[PDB]
Structure formats: structure tokens, C-alpha cells
Amino acid sequence: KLVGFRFASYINNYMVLQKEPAGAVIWGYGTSEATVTVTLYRDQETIMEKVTSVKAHSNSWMVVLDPMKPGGPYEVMAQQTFGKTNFTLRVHDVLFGDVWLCSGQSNMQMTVSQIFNATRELANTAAYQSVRIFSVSLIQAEQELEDLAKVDLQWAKPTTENLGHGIFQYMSAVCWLFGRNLYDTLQYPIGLISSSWGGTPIEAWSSERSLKACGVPTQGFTQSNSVTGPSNHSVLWNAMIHPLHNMTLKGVIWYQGESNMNFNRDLYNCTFPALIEDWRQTFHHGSQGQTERFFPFGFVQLSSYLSAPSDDTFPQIRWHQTADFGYVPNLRMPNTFMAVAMDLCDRKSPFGSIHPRDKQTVAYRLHLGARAVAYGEKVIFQGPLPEKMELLADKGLLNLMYSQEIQVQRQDKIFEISCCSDHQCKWLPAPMDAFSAQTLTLSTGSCHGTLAAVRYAWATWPCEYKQCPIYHPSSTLPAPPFIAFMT
Numbered sequence: 001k002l003v004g005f006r007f008a009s010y011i012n013n014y015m016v017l018q019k020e021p022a023g024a025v026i027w028g029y030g031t032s033e034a035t036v037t038v039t040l041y042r043d044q045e046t047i048m049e050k051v052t053s054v055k056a057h058s059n060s061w062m063v064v065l066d067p068m069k070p071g072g073p074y075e076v077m078a079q080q081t082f083g084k085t086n087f088t089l090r091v092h093d094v095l096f097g098d099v100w101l102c103s104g105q106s107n108m109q110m111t112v113s114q115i116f117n118a119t120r121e122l123a124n125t126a127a128y129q130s131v132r133i134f135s136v137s138l139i140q141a142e143q144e145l146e147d148l149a150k151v152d153l154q155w156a157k158p159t160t161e162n163l164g165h166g167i168f169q170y171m172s173a174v175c176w177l178f179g180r181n182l183y184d185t186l187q188y189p190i191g192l193i194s195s196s197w198g199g200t201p202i203e204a205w206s207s208e209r210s211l212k213a214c215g216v217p218t219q220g221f222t223q224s225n226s227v228t229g230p231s232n233h234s235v236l237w238n239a240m241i242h243p244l245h246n247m248t249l250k251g252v253i254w255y256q257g258e259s260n261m262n263f264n265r266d267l268y269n270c271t272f273p274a275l276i277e278d279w280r281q282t283f284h285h286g287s288q289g290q291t292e293r294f295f296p297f298g299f300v301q302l303s304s305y306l307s308a309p310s311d312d313t314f315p316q317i318r319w320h321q322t323a324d325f326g327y328v329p330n331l332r333m334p335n336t337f338m339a340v341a342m343d344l345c346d347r348k349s350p351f352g353s354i355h356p357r358d359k360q361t362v363a364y365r366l367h368l369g370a371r372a373v374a375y376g377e378k379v380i381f382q383g384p385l386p387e388k389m390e391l392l393a394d395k396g397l398l399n400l401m402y403s404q405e406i407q408v409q410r411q412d413k414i415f416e417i418s419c420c421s422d423h424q425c426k427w428l429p430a431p432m433d434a435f436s437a438q439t440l441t442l443s444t445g446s447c448h449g450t451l452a453a454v455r456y457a458w459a460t461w462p463c464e465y466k467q468c469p470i471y472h473p474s475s476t477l478p479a480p481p482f483i484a485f486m487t
């Protein structure tokens with residue numbers, strides 16, 4: 001059995017390895033029982049060394065480096081000794097910093113060349129040479145893969161050519177812009193790994209464990225107009241995520257759910273929290289405990305598209321993305337953060353309205369949540385949501401008391417109330433009647449019955465671009481959609 005001495009496929013020139021307090025995992029393949037010495041250099045000087053042996057059967061080897069301050073460059077060498085043989089592997093331009101994995105479906109996959117202001121965005125790289133980029137090839141596998149089968153974009157300094165290399169190819173716009181925003185704040189190296197595929201349901205990205213935890217039914221024939229990518233359970237976890245699970249990382253950002261609009265829709269409130277938890281457990285263990293057990297996990301609540309009037313699948317998914325709380329983090333989704341995108345619509349996208357071109361605001365909103373949840377900063381990252389409600393049935397009023405200050409444009413249809421009479425309920429629009437800094441009063445007088453619930457922005461396309469009715473007055477964040485039941 002002759003096994004080449006090689007690094008795992010996440011290791012390359014120009015890469016970013018996770019910084020202190022974590023140790024960075026370095027692993028590869030080689031000859032059974034050979035000794036592998038991994039050395040970190042700064043030019044010719046030795047910074048640290050780790051020694052291990054190649055395991056029989058798997059022919060794999062692994063070390064965990066001591067924690068490193070962010071920065072660089074460094075070189076990593078691995079040297080295998082077996083009898084009198086001596087082979088060496090070397091990578092250079094290695095940095096230490098925060099490694100973020102970006103995944104999901106086509107609004108993660110959409111690249112910098114596809115977005116608004118693309119020419120200027122593609123040109124803005126000289127200040128960001130320490131924001132290193134990587135993109136995983138579109139591969140599916142019936143079993144978990146130990147190593148990536150193929151890499152589309154190996155670790156690289158960002159350029160016009162590799163940020164905008166092809167339509168839905170690389171580099172992910174949301175991922176790049178998120179990292180660019182992180183660099184502005186952090187001023188130390190950022191590594192970005194994009195691993196996404198259009199038209200894919202969450203089940204494709206989930207291991208068997210999270211699917212079983214949620215009671216997901218066995219697959220039938222799942223391709224439909226809204227599921228155009230790989231849809232067999234776990235096949236993208238298996239090939240495009242699992243091979244990264246031993247690599248130490250900082251967190252994940254995620255943009256997916258469009259393809260669950262008609263595929264296990266009513267389970268998404270389980271399957272998405274369960275994906276987060278299973279990725280966390282699996283990466284924590286694969287990385288020898290170095291990746292945080294509750295590593296921060298950020299996501300984009302679905303944007304809009306120009307749909308049929310009857311369709312309220314997207315509002316349901318948006319709600320389920322928060323585990324039906326309306327906000328994250330929450331009791332079922334610790335250390336998570338969300339960007340609202342329903343107001344970031346695009347009627348004229350050449351990629352279809354499902355692919356809106358403003359990824360800049362998506363990445364800005366994500367980065368606020370990362371600053372708060374992933375970095376501990378006291379920064380506003382959630383939009384205004386009611387904390388309490390007061391029904392004044394005799395006056396025909398419903399007061400909503402918000403979490404934060406509100407800036408409200410008059411809009412008499414954005415809120416609806418569920419009006420129950422004669423053993424049936426109907427949703428009716430609820431006009432805005434009165435305002436104070438944190439309380440909005442709705443009129444319920446058109447309901448000649450009992451009020452069971454209220455909802456806000458519960459439509460596939462609730463508003464025109466950056467024209468939703470309620471924002472915070474200064475954070476720029478929109479009020480998220482919600483439903484609330486009366487007691």
C-alpha cells in the first residue's frame with residue numbers, strides 16, 4: 001500500500017489558519033507509521049514544531065499547532081521520515097486570523113461580478129490583500145468524504161479576476177463582502193471559504209444526524225421548479241462541508257432556504273437549528289476541540305422575489321429560519337445572528353428577482369450581527385420587534401410596544417389581524433392609527449369578532465427596495481416580519 005505524503009486539500013499557499021486562542025489543525029496523508037514533523041517558520045526561523053505518526057488503515061496524520069497571534073506571513077513545512085526516506089511539503093504566505101465558512105444556495109453562490117456596482121467592487125482589493133479567498137467545487141457524494149475532491153479556487157489574495165471569475169462560479173459576493181467588512185473592523189487576516197450550490201434544500205447540506213433528529217421523511221423524487229440542484233439527503237454535506245470539519249474555524253455564514261419553500265417546509269424550524277447544532281458538534285470534535293463548541297453561525301433571512309399572490313411559503317420559511325421566534329439568538333439557536341433581506345429586493349435583476357443584486361447591504365447587516373455575537377461588541381444588530389402587545393377591544397385598538405425606537409411610514413396594509421367570527425377566521429389589513437417613540441397603535445375596528453393574531457410584512461414581496469414601513473431611526477435595520485398570537 002503506497003500512499004503519497006500530501007496535505008489535506010484545505011492547506012495551500014496563501015491560506016489563513018485560525019488564530020489564538022484556538023490551535024490550528026494541520027492534517028494530511030502519508031506512509032503508515034512514518035514520523036511527520038510539522039514546522040512553522042518565519043523565513044528561515046523556527047517558530048514551533050509538532051511531531052506525530054501516520055495512522056495505519058487511514059494513512060492519515062494530524063497535528064494541532066500552538067495558538068498563534070494573528071498576522072504573518074509564515075511558512076508551514078511538513079516532513080515525513082520513514083526509514084531513510086525524507087519527503088517535504090511546504091506552503092508559504094500563510095496567515096493567522098479568523099476563518100469563516102460561507103455556505104447555502106444561489107444567493108450565497110452569486111459572485112462579485114453579478115452585483116450592483118460590480119466594476120468598482122471588483123477593483124477594491126488593494127486594502128484587502130489579507131482577506132484570503134477559497135471556493136469549493138460543486139461535487140456531490142453518496143458518502144462522507146474525508147478530503148475535498150476538487151477545489152475551484154485555491155487560497156488566494158483577492159484580485160479583480162478571481163473575485164469576478166464567472167456567473168455563479170466564484171467568488172461569492174455575500175462571503176467576500178462580509179469578510180471585507182470584518183477586515184475593516186478587525187484589521188487582521190480573514191480567510192473566506194465559499195461552499196454553496198444553487199437550488200439546494202437544507203437536507204442536502206445536513207448530515208444524517210440532524211435529519212434523524214427532526215424526523216425528516218425518507219426522500220422520494222424531490223426535483224421540482226424550486227429544487228434544481230442536488231437534493232438527495234446529505235450529499236453536499238458529504239462532499240462540500242464534511243471534508244473541512246477537522247479544520248479549525250471561527251464561524252459560518254449561511255444563505256439558504258428558497259429551495260425549502262415546498263420541501264419539508266414545516267420542518268425547517270427544526271432542520272435549520274439542528275443543522276447548526278450538528279455542524280457545531282461535528283466541527284468541534286473534528287478539530288480536536290479547537291473550533292468553538294457553539295461557534296457563531298450567521299444567516300440571511302430570505303429576500304423576496306416576484307411570486308404569485310397566493311404564495312406565502314417565503315414568509316413561512318423566514319419565520320422558521322428563526323425557529324419561529326422572529327429573532328436570533330434565541331433559546332433554540334444560541335450564538336446565531338441574522339440579516340433581514342426582505343427589503344433588499346430587485347425587480348430588474350438579470351438573474352431573476354430571486355437573485356437581487358444588492359449583496360452589499362446583506363453583508364453589512366450580517367457583519368453587524370457578527371460584531372455583536374461573534375466578537376462581543378455592543379452594537380445594534382436586530383431590527384425593531386414588538387416585545388408586548390395590548391388589545392383594547394372596546395376602543396378597537398391594538399398597541400404594539402417595540403424593543404427599540406421605530407421610524408414608521410404610514411402603511412395601512414403591512415399589518416394584518418386575524419379576525420374570528422361565526423367559527424371562521426380571516427386576515428384583514430390593520431391601519432396604523434397612532435404613534436409614539438416605541439408604541440404603534442393599529443385600528444382593529446374592521447374586525448367584527450375576536451382578534452386571534454397579528455402579523456407584519458407577511459408577504460413574499462412586502463415592500464419596495466429599502467422602503468419597508470418600519471426601520472430603526474438610526475441603525476438602518478428594518479423591523480423583521482413576525483406573527484404573534486393573542487392570549
Ligand SMILES: *[C@@H]1O[C@H](CO[C@@H]2O[C@@H](C)[C@@H](O)[C@@H](O)[C@@H]2O)[C@@H](O[C@@H]2O[C@H](CO)[C@@H](O[C@@H]3O[C@H](CO[C@H]4O[C@H](CO)[C@@H](O)[C@H](O)[C@@H]4O)[C@@H](O)[C@H](O[C@H]4O[C@H](CO)[C@@H](O)[C@H](O)[C@@H]4O)[C@@H]3O)[C@H](O)[C@H]2NC(C)=O)[C@H](O)[C@H]1NC(C)=O
Pocket residue numbers: 044081086087088
Ligand atoms: C530531510 O530533508 C530536509 C529538507 O531538505 C530537503 O529535502 C532533502 C531530502 C534534500 O533533497 C534537500 O536538498 C532539501 O532541501 C533536510 O533539511 C535541510 O537540509 C539541507 C542540507 O543540509 C539544508 O540546506 C543547507 O543549508 C546550509 C545552511 O543554509 C544557511 O546558511 C547558508 C550559508 O551561510 C545561507 O546561504 C542560507 O540562506 C541558509 O541561511 C547551506 O549552506 C547549504 O548550501 C550548500 O548546499 C546546497 C545543496 O544542499 C547548494 O545548493 C548550495 O549552493 C551550498 O553549496 C544547504 O542549502 C537545509 O537548511 C535544511 N532545511 C531545514 C528546514 O532544516 C534535513 O536535514 C533532512 N532530515 C533528515 C532527518 O534526514
Ligand SMILES: *[C@@H]1O[C@H](CO)[C@@H](O[C@@H]2O[C@H](CO)[C@@H](O[C@@H]3O[C@H](CO)[C@@H](O)[C@H](O[C@H]4O[C@H](CO)[C@@H](O)[C@H](O)[C@@H]4O)[C@@H]3O)[C@H](O)[C@H]2NC(C)=O)[C@H](O)[C@H]1NC(C)=O
Pocket residue numbers: 116117120121123124184185360
Ligand atoms: C462601489 O464600490 C466602491 C468600492 O468598494 C465603494 O467605494 C468604497 O466605499 C467605502 C465605503 O463603503 C469607502 O470606505 C472608506 O475608505 C476610506 C479611505 O480608504 C477609509 O478611511 C474609511 O474608513 C472609515 O469607514 C470604515 C467603514 O466603512 C471604518 O472601518 C473606519 O474605521 C473609518 O471610520 C472607509 O473605509 C472606500 O474608500 C471606497 N473605496 C474605493 C476604492 O472607492 C462605493 O461606495 C460603492 N458604491 C456603491 C453605490 O455601492
Ligand SMILES: *[C@@H]1O[C@H](CO)[C@@H](O[C@@H]2O[C@H](CO)[C@@H](O[C@@H]3O[C@H](CO)[C@@H](O)[C@H](O)[C@@H]3O)[C@H](O)[C@H]2NC(C)=O)[C@H](O)[C@H]1NC(C)=O
Pocket residue numbers: 027028060061062245246282285286287
Ligand atoms: C477528523 O475528525 C474525525 C472526527 O470527527 C476523526 O475521526 C475520528 O478519529 C478518531 C481518532 O482516530 C476515532 O476515535 C477512535 O475510535 C476507536 C474506535 O474504533 C477507539 O477505540 C479509539 O480509542 C479512538 O477513540 C473516531 O472513531 C473517529 N470518528 C469518526 C466519527 O469517524 C478523523 O480521524 C479526523 N481526521 C483526521 C485526518 O485525523
Ligand SMILES: *[C@@H]1O[C@H](CO)[C@@H](O[C@@H]2O[C@H](CO)[C@@H](O)[C@H](O)[C@H]2NC(C)=O)[C@H](O)[C@H]1NC(C)=O
Pocket residue numbers: 266267269270323324
Ligand atoms: C414548525 O412549524 C410548524 C408549522 O407552523 C409547527 O406545526 C404547527 O404546530 C402546532 C402546534 O403543535 C399545530 O397545532 C399545527 O397544526 C402545526 N402545523 C402544521 C402545518 O404542522 C411546528 O410546531 C413548528 N415546530 C417547531 C419545532 O417550531
Ligand SMILES: *[C@@H]1O[C@H](CO)[C@@H](O)[C@H](O)[C@H]1NC(C)=O
Pocket residue numbers: 232
Ligand atoms: C439520489 O438517490 C437515489 C436513491 O438512492 C439514487 O438512485 C440517485 O442516483 C441519487 N441521485 C444522484 C443525482 O446521485
